[PDB]
Design a protein around this ligand. Sequence first.
Ligand SMILES: CC(=O)N[C@H]1[C@H](O[C@H]2[C@@H](O)[C@@H](CO)O[C@@H](O[C@H]3[C@H](O)[C@@H](O)[C@H](O)O[C@@H]3CO)[C@@H]2O)O[C@H](CO)[C@@H](O[C@@H]2O[C@H](CO[C@]3(C(=O)O)C[C@H](O)[C@@H](NC(C)=O)[C@H]([C@H](O)[C@H](O)CO)O3)[C@H](O)[C@H](O)[C@H]2O)[C@@H]1O
Ligand SMILES: CC(=O)N[C@@H]1[C@@H](O)[C@H](O)[C@@H](CO)O[C@@H]1O
Ligand SMILES: CC(=O)N[C@@H]1[C@@H](O)[C@H](O)[C@@H](CO)O[C@@H]1O
Ligand SMILES: CC(=O)N[C@@H]1[C@@H](O)[C@H](O)[C@@H](CO)O[C@@H]1O
Lengths: 324, 324, 324, 160, 160, 160
Amino acid sequence: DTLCIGYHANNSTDTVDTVLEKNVTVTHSVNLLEDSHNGKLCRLGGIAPLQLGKCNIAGWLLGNPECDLLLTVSSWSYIVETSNSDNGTCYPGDFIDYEELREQLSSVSSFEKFEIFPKTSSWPNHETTRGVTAACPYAGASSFYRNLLWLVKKGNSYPKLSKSYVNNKGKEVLVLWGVHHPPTSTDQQSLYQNADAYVSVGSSKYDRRFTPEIAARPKVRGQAGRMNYYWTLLEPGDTITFEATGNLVAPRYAFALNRGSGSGIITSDAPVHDCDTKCQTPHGAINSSLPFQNIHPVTIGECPKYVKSTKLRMATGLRNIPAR
Amino acid sequence: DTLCIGYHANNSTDTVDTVLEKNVTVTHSVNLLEDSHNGKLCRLGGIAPLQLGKCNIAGWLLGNPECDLLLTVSSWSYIVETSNSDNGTCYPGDFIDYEELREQLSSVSSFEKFEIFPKTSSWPNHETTRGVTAACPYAGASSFYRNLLWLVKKGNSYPKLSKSYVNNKGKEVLVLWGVHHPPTSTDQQSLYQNADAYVSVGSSKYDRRFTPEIAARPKVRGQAGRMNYYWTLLEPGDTITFEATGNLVAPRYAFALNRGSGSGIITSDAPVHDCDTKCQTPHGAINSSLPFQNIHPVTIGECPKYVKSTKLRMATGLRNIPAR
Amino acid sequence: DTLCIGYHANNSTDTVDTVLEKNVTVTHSVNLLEDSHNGKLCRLGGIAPLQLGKCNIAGWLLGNPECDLLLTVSSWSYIVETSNSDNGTCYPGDFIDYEELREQLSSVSSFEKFEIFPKTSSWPNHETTRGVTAACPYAGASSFYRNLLWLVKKGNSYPKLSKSYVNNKGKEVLVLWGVHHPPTSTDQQSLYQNADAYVSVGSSKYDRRFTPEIAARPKVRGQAGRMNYYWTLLEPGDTITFEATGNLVAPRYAFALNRGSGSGIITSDAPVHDCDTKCQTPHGAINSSLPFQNIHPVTIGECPKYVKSTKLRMATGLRNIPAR
Amino acid sequence: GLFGAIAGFIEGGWTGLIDGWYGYHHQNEQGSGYAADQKSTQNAIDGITNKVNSVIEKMNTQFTAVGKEFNNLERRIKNLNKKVDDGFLDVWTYNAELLVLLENERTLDFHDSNVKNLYEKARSQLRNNAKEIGNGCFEFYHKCDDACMESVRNGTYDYP
Amino acid sequence: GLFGAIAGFIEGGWTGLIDGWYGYHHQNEQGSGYAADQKSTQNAIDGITNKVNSVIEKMNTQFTAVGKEFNNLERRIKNLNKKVDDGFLDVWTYNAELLVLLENERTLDFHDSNVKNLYEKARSQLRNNAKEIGNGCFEFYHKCDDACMESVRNGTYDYP
Amino acid sequence: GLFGAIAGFIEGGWTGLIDGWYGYHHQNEQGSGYAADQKSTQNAIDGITNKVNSVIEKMNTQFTAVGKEFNNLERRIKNLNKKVDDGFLDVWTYNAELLVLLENERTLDFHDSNVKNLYEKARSQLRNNAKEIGNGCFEFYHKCDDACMESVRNGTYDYP
Ligand SMILES: CC(=O)N[C@H]1[C@H](O[C@H]2[C@@H](O)[C@@H](CO)O[C@@H](O[C@H]3[C@H](O)[C@@H](O)[C@H](O)O[C@@H]3CO)[C@@H]2O)O[C@H](CO)[C@@H](O[C@@H]2O[C@H](CO[C@]3(C(=O)O)C[C@H](O)[C@@H](NC(C)=O)[C@H]([C@H](O)[C@H](O)CO)O3)[C@H](O)[C@H](O)[C@H]2O)[C@@H]1O
Ligand SMILES: CC(=O)N[C@@H]1[C@@H](O)[C@H](O)[C@@H](CO)O[C@@H]1O
Ligand SMILES: CC(=O)N[C@@H]1[C@@H](O)[C@H](O)[C@@H](CO)O[C@@H]1O
Ligand SMILES: CC(=O)N[C@@H]1[C@@H](O)[C@H](O)[C@@H](CO)O[C@@H]1O
């Protein structure tokens, strides 16, 4: 009569590495590394993402004519820019602190767009119907930003304008505007009369003065002139005031921002789908409980920690010795 | 006759965690995590901290009328701001590179405050007695910063002023000044005559020119105008020259800085007490030899490393099996 | 008869540390910490490094008179500045975004210097031969930067100049220029006639206007005036346009840049020698396969990981017990 | 093996054992078969499970992490930002791969030790009543039936 | 335990032993009592003290570390700075908790090893002059007085 | 030693053995000498060689890493840049020194484990045909010549 002591063995082909030996076949093990995604841009918390498509943040917030599709959107899980998000400022110029604004939008989950300075009632003494350019076409016709209003002289007169808005929203109000710099003094005159015009903008915190910089610059989109864009976050109950004797590309629509959660902007060329996920990457959604992933360092939601590993498998069982 | 071999065991209730098992009772162990502090702001290097109280750095360096309790302090081991440090720039405006100055104060152990531009003898051709504002009141009456001097025209005249100072202290000298911006052109004349005034400041390294930006900005503390504050560190031997035809809020007192040891500004409501310590945090002082602490990420002096751990105990003895 | 089971032992003096015991002599061990370097600056990928010597990045690119040694160099494996690289901007002023320019150069392995605006043919209506200063002397006589051209009025007339250059090199073109600021308006007029001169620079992306700032500043290198330096990277196919009614220190030589590899600028006083290396530090080159080195944190090429450790040795053999 | 049992003085495993990691064979006159030791197997399962969960506890989940854009005049902070992302990535990748390697080594030793302790346990129970044949088997002197073999498994047996 | 001694074939500890971690009991005809083995206890103490000191050596102290302020147009660098402070915080919290975890496992196995070694030592000393009762005790054949018991403790005894 | 062999019941090494880490002495009537066990020594070398290789793999090389300059109004990003440089530098130094320390412990334990197993292997091979003298030596009863000694080494012997 005999009694032996032994250990388990099976037909597992799972292998793991150890300090003293690589490629050791074991009976049981768990893979800790997730490497699969669905290749789609899904919604998080039931909210669809914002597909900027052919447009980028600048174009979206300014109301570039080519971004009309976005006009009715005001809630999103995350903002998506593609490789072809080239539609921004159709009229050449510098967008001041543009990166900082993008940064600010990363914690904005939704907003309420409102016509801060109505076009048909805010400017009785200035022309409101000639601010178009072939640089910002729409349907082949010269047009302009939907959220800004390019004001020019009225009957050879550009009186000093003064306009104010009191933040009545109970939240932050992103206000955008622009300052146009004509290429020549004659253009300056045909547009605003005042050879020496200026634009002034202020609030309890914001305070800046703008001076037209006349000069012919290498043409971009047919324009030798330039238009610079500015923004600021008007705090609740605070007041923003605009003063100008010319060159003001006045605010038309503004945004009451809603901070909401760690959200953000991603650059992806992956398509959107009627799909839900708790974890989103620029390559597609991850549905996993594993602690690690090597899909992409950029994630949104609750995701496994990004790691550059190709394999992370833990032995749970023992050295498999079928000894067949 | 029998002889056995065994191991120690006591009544210790100490427990530690291991890879394989949690909450294991052991004979002896050592706590490595410090979680106690005296809830007080003590002195370091045998020197008391500078308590700003109702004031913030700005109020202190500029000399906001409400910060007179600090006028006599000139040496400190660290700076303390409270939840109520709102007394800063009583006259609305922008403090340029404010965060940089604060960073610069990090290693300042003390300074030698001196009247760089004696009020009663530096400006024979300008009014030195009307630079007050209801925005910076003292004892109910209109006043101003103690360290700056708001110059205005004398008898309808504001001559081009030119004042220079040679850093003779054998160390850095922090110089602060302001540039005023009236809300209207009539105030600009009432104040400085010259319609097109300017301010120029220069040293071997610093060079900047300021122009008045007239405009009625939303009123803050009653002011529709604005006042910007500037500073620069004058190197040993260098010279600083101020030129102006108006709008200059001239330096009155400046500070010769002495460098001490890595220190800084902390925000805390804890009370200062006659007490000493080698390690200070915003919550209280630490007296420990332990390698870690979960008291506060912010520390001053020599401290255990901050960690987010709840428990860190190493087993020194063995598994406690009293087998009672 | 007897048979015994034992283990090797030798005369090795090697020692290693363990968690439980320090200084344990073992039979065999490997060193993982490289601490040797040849104390010399060698070449990488067979290319010599750029020794700026007495000059620094500014003096080199601008073409400081004391950096003529560098004029012929157009290719390098890395840039070296010494403790005496003090030859930079001989004429006092501010080098705008200087640190950024240096950062840009870190990814430049070579360039092709070309006379963007030929001196004897680009400015027919302006004086091109009086732009020298005693602050930028060469061979005792006052001189100027080899790459910029200080233009001044020609026979009491500084007409509005306008000069354009179309980047046509197929790569980024580094363009440098300056704006001069006279100490007095009397100088402003002797140099450029126009009292209200201006300089305008524009491309598809760049757009900036400069205004003279006249004022007597503390003299530096005998100059009470200031000269500010600027640069920009003209993209392939883009155009850069200069407009000026005075004060412009014009581009003469520009650089078509070739991005290369991770390279950089180092500060070292180690000598340059006919030598090669895959790994280079400011103290000397390294020739090693070890994973770690404690020579220097800064390295160029393929080097062992920097570490502050004094000793890193793994026991491979066993505790040595010669029991002699 | 660090304890000489697994792949040691007990050359191979039993595909035949199928209800645990460690068990017995037994070739009693009544028949043959396999029976896994619960005590051992469950204790091991509790520890390895706790080991895996510990590894996972330590590793932090990743929430929303998105890039920042920089203009053409902010290359230094842009490179700094990248040095920070690359730095932590290299560190965490190192931490994750190293911890898994080290634990995998521990884990295999843990099993080896468990087998060894089981052998020595069954060995100190039998004593003179059986001889060590090697390969982890014990040949009885007094013949042991199923009723008896079971006493050895549940550590009762007893008979110096 | 990894070596089967502690909480193993020696089921428990002696609240009685009070002059060391590892020791002897002995119930000689003259009497009974407890005597801790110095050799082992001290060696183990030196090792553990060295381990504790080493852990503390690697962990760097923390000097002055305060916060930095940023304006409303520096949200990007502010976030960069926070990403840096949080990153290192998580890394060190990780290292600290993990080092303690792993060493605690090592420590208990160290003690387990020591007891085991002590037993095999006292065992190879007796050989035929006593029998292994299990539970770590040895019963002498030739009877052993206090003067003889001590010889076992200080590894003298000798008598194949 | 964690396993009691090296610096344990086998007090010292043999400067004599010179063809391996683990060997036999043998003092047969025909003569004396030393012979290293290949099976053991080579397994140990492969393992330790993999250990060193694994350690080196994990440690990432370091390419071009050059400093940055900051003007006098960028003390915050400069310090941020330094806090990142010292931060990663401290972390890797800790990782380097700590991995080495722990692996050194494990390495010696490995050898100790190997010696012990070799002993126990030669031991279960002889059984009755010799007695345990201690110090790791076995004294044959039936006398063992060179042709016999070699049978023990290559694990053939066999003779209950
Ligand atoms: C500079 C000043 O005092 N501005 C006042 C302004 O005063 C005008 C008033 O005295 C009329 C009366 O005839 O005369 C003006 O004009 C002369 C003109 O320039 C000249 O060319 C011509 O030949 O003769 C005329 C007649 O002399 C004066 O400019 O009045 C308004 C209405 O009350 C003031 O506005 C309100 O001001 C409040 C703040 O007042 C203070 C303050 O801080 O408390 C008073 C301080 O004394 C003053 N500091 C000085 C001079 O150093 C400051 C300072 O002017 C501001 O900070 C500048 O921005 O003001 C508060 O702002 C309230 O909300 C306003 O409605 C205006 O300040
Ligand atoms: C208003 C506007 O931006 N229109 C342009 C369009 O003319 C151009 O063809 C396209 C190319 O990407 O970009 C933008 O859509
Ligand atoms: C000059 C000045 O700053 N005074 C104000 C004071 O009027 C106000 O009541 C207090 C409230 O925080 O702040 C400051 O002390
Ligand atoms: C044009 C120029 O730069 N000349 C100066 C030279 O006069 C001075 O002696 C030297 C000191 O480092 O610096 C520069 O070379």
